[PDB]
Subunit: 247 residues, 4 copies
């Protein structure tokens, strides 16, 4: 199938991806890079696609390089203001034989969840979000949670909906979660847990719940391979795995 | 918005739908029929769309009639062999100002669940189904469960997948559910419960669960209105609400 | 088994209990009362135990009466300040052939949940609560939720525990629920749902969740019969079904 | 608090426990043993309690030894026919200053779950079990699942109950799980998951679900410390953590 290099291949993250390639039947693992060591090496080895996790300082450089030498790239490095997107967009004009994908999330379950919730939202009068995570976690609600809710809120504003039913005569502080474009979001910090979302939708007689659960820090990898196995047919720049999923 | 009649309007089922119309802002309730009383009455009253729950003996007749006088119809009556579909198809040639919809299920949650599971299946190595229902229930697994699983199995055969990982050295009878095109399906009969599905998908590090829950015999109604509010832009014959949902 | 009367037997509530008796093999249904009609009738009919749902104005009277004529009583009427308990306590001195039970909740699932959570709390560093209910509901969090949490908090203060791990650098308002004696409680209002609790406990490597679900306004009845079938061996005054359960 | 040794302290298992001690404020870690190296060392170091994971060949020996020199022991080694229990019982006559605990399970969540299910079973007409585990797993249903169900079945036979409601006209093979003393048990193998149980109870209007979830191979450790922190007040032989929990 595909020849593949990895950048930042020695982090926690690196190793898991490294392995995932080897383990895969259809993907030949063709390089590895410390962080800032010599990129040339990709071409020498003839890599078709790279997976990048480099410090946002480096990232833009390797990007330019990869694009220049026709290599497509699957990026999960953070820090992409619309300036940086605009840089990349610019790098990519009239090539149509090379792609970039920037996935702020690679947890397919998470992604799919985001996706489906958007699709579902127009049919249910009620909709809330609940998010759960180990207690060490710095911020509440999770980013993912927040995005979910915004996306729901979108789907509703579009396809013009009201606000949702709630006959709560003066509720207790905290008790109805954080409002996020009118979507309640509840954050639960629980020793033993890892990372989990749960989106509930309500209508007459029924509910639909979509819930994602990560058991383990390495859930990104299936994401990344979906990227790698398909970037090859998504030239140019894409942001969000959702788009690679063909939905 | 729309003028609407109902057939079989005195069953359990009828009443709930009757109300749902009135209650609705944009739908004028324009008739009611015992079961076999005179259909004429629809035209006299100038109905744009009907909702039908008649004994499968009657149904085909009212159908013909409705189509003949340009009225579109949302059918939840059972019993539609491909002969009967073929009848209807035939009734409908060169009209394109009239539709039928045949929804073997109107539980949106259920439908959406069916739908999303099909979309999700290609990404997860594991996938099982669990279905739960009050104990009175005659048959296991539920029809809905079975359909779900087949649809999953489809999505996998297409987008050619293997069978799923299961290192079970001689399992105990019953313990791994019923195989349904290679999809385990578990049926749970539980006093207090009503009707519920739950579809689990498994990959490295993660899961995605989609679960539908009906609290109440009347969950079909939101279905039916989605039908009514849209048949108007789906002339011809359609089978399955999934298609009205625009996904 | 037992001869039984009912007071307030024509409310929504009444009917369900009425039936529950008949339906029961071991319980002969021996009376019915409008609300304030003549109690005498119990003795005439020779009732061993009554179930009472009368307006808190009446209740205390029928109580006195029942106790006076040796009839035991299962009360689910609200409004029992410690004054009123003290009244009843007083009514009951040196009888030991008659009981009262006052159950502020008769949902066994709910009760058991309350109970088990108290028992479990000492083993888990983390513990949160989530409560879900149809959107019509007036108050958040539910009473039941709040009680749960207090009871948890108790079990922890006793068996002296710390506060729980939460490294949340300035969380968003609402997002971590309402604090209730240091227990986060999340309230979710969701069309289609009825009444549900869910108590999560967290420790190294694991969780325990206990979740109660009412599908239907009549879940109190099993409560009430547990009462009736056992008051006979709990003379005096008891408050809370928990105590009848023999745990 | 307590001085503590560990046997089999270099396995996967060992390390996690080692750490758990150090990390603990009130427990001084006072030894470590390869597997068969010299036990003397415990006394030299003055250990009050040991935690043992040795090959069932060794175990009985170290046991004898520990008991002989007054050291109490928390054992999670498998393989304890009633012969072996009888051995130990015999070792322990007239000491009452030393204990053993044999915990076939140390997952508190799991244990508590077992426990509560037994307590709950008498109140609900319906009761089923569902068990879920990574797909690598050799056997279905899990041991834990099976025990759960038996314990439920017990609690029912005692407190004489019927069989449960199920109007299933000829069900599909597999679909109603494995019968286990009349308790349906469903086994789900799901990539991404680890180890999980879920016990559902059903009555009129309601359910109670108790569900345990292990996220991680090390959930035994809280078990083990509950042991260690309490064996000191449970001289003699005990089998099952349930008994240390004081319920």
């Amino acid at each position: 199938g595909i020849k593949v290099g990895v950048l930042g291949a020695k982090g926690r993250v690196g190793q898991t991806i490294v392995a995932a390639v080897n383990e895969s039947d259809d993907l030949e693992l063709v390089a590895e890079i410390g962080v800032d060591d010599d990129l040339s090496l990709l071409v020498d080895n003839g890599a078709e696609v790279v997976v990048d996790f480099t410090t946002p300082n480096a990232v833009m450089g390797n990007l330019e390089f990869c694009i220049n030498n026709g290599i497509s790239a699957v990026v999960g490095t953070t820090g992409f203001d619309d300036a940086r997107l605009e840089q990349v967009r610019d790098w990519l004009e009239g090539k149509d034989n090379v792609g970039v994908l920037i996935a702020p999330n690679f947890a397919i379950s998470a992604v799919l969840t985001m996706v489906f919730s958007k699709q579902a939202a127009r049919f249910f009068e009620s909709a809330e979000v609940i998010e759960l995570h180990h207690p060490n976690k710095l911020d509440a609600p999770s980013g993912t949670a927040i995005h979910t809710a915004q996306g729901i809120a979108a789907a509703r504003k579009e396809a013009g909906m009201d606000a949702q039913p709630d006959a709560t005569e003066q509720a207790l502080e905290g008790s109805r979660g954080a409002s996020v474009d009118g979507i309640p979001v509840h954050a639960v910090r629980m020793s033993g847990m890892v990372a989990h979302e749960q989106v509930i939708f309500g209508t007459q007689g029924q509910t639909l719940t979509i819930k994602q659960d990560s058991y383990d820090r390495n859930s990104f990898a299936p994401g990344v391979l979906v990227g790698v196995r398909n970037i090859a047919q998504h030239p140019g720049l894409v942001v969000g795995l959702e788009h690679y999923l063909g939905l």
